[PDB]
Design a protein around this ligand. Structure first.
Ligand code: PXY
Length: 162
């Protein structure tokens, strides 16, 4: 299993503009287009991201391109983030993936807010981190996804995904 396969399970793949769980316009494999209520704004954003007149629809190929860019962006974001980098550097391969997943989902800022959890991760206090990270809006809004990422952090294995 790898990051792409992981994220592909958690986000799905939709070729037509759709509303994510918070009601935001998205497309592909979890690619947020805009936080604005307007489908037009969404459609504009899409054309601009794709480089053509998509008319709210993209191809698999296009979805995968956006996905490749977003995953790269998440990794580079972590590596540039003063708060995130050390955590990332301290983790084993599987757990790194879990951190990449969260960042992809909620952005650097959002993840950087799990101060106490990050600290525990850094101290290799797996069980405590899992319990603390569960006390969050994130967990309460998308419990199933959250549980899968949390188990990955807790155990360092891909069990939650197999
Ligand atoms: C940021 C974060 C760290 C650890 C867990 C278990 C959940 C979230």
């Amino acid at each position: 299993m790898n990051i792409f396969e992981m994220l592909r399970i958690d986000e799905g793949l939709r070729l037509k503009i759709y509303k994510d769980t918070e009601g935001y316009y998205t497309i592909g494999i979890g690619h947020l287009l805009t936080k604005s209520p307007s489908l037009n704004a969404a459609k504009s954003e899409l054309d601009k991201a794709i480089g053509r007149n998509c008319n709210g629809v993209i191809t698999k190929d296009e979805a995968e391109k956006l996905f490749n860019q977003d995953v790269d962006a998440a990794v580079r974001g972590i590596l540039r983030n003063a708060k995130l980098k050390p955590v990332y550097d301290s983790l084993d391969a599987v757990r790194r993936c879990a951190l990449i997943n969260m960042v992809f989902q909620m952005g650097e800022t959002g993840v950087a807010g799990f101060t106490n959890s990050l600290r525990m991760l850094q101290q290799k206090r797996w069980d405590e981190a899992a319990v603390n990270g569960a006390k969050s809006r994130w967990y309460n809004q998308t419990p199933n996804r959250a549980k899968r990422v949390i188990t990955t952090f807790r155990t360092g294995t891909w069990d939650a995904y197999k």
